[PDB]
Amino acid sequence: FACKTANGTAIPIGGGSANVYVNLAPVVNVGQNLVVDLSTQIFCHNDYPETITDYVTLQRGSAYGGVLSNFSGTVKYSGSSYPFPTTSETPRVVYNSRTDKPWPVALYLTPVSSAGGVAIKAGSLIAVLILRQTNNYNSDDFQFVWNIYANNDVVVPT
Numbered sequence: 001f002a003c004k005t006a007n008g009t010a011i012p013i014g015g016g017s018a019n020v021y022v023n024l025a026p027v028v029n030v031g032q033n034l035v036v037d038l039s040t041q042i043f044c045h046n047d048y049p050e051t052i053t054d055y056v057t058l059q060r061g062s063a064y065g066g067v068l069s070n071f072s073g074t075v076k077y078s079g080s081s082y083p084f085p086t087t088s089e090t091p092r093v094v095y096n097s098r099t100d101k102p103w104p105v106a107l108y109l110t111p112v113s114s115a116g117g118v119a120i121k122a123g124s125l126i127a128v129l130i131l132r133q134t135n136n137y138n139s140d141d142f143q144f145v146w147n148i149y150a151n152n153d154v155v156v157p158t
């Protein structure tokens with residue numbers, strides 16, 4: 001089991017860390033969602049599906065910088081909604097193919113009423129998301145840590 005980003009940055013068997021740089025809608029009004037769709041950015045696969053079934057959760061999601069201070073967050077994992085920053089590990093999604101499959105995570109970030117002006121700064125860390133991978137075969141329990149960075153400033157109009 002291993003994963004990669006849309007630009008080919010890999011985290012190999014056994015886990016590890018990678019940075020993911022995302023373009024963000026540059027203007028987001030109070031009452032709208034800023035959507036960070038990681039399912040187009042992070043992909044994973046099973047290396048031995050003949051024998052092993054892989055299980056994958058979002059173990060934790062943490063907010064940083066302007067997302068921590070200026071937004072109210074929800075994460076969707078395989079379509080189901082949970083608070084972000086997270087309060088529990090999600091259910092498991094099965095990976096049973098060598099073909100790359102999206103990691104089905106998206107963040108929905110809506111401005112808090114006090115937000116105004118530059119609410120996220122270009123180049124800043126906005127989230128750390130931990131993918132936890134286990135299987136039905138041995139004791140492997142690995143973390144794939146995704147550090148999510150903003151490519152651009154985001155303004156909440158005033």
Ligand SMILES: CC(=O)c1cnc(N[C@H]2O[C@H](CO)[C@@H](O)[C@H](O)[C@@H]2O)s1
Nearest residue numbers: 001013014046047048052054135140
């Ligand atoms: C041939 C053989 O013994 C093995 C091949 N890969 C192994 N193991 C690797 O791939 C598995 C399937 O994605 C994962 O469950 C393991 O955690 C590990 O990533 S053991």
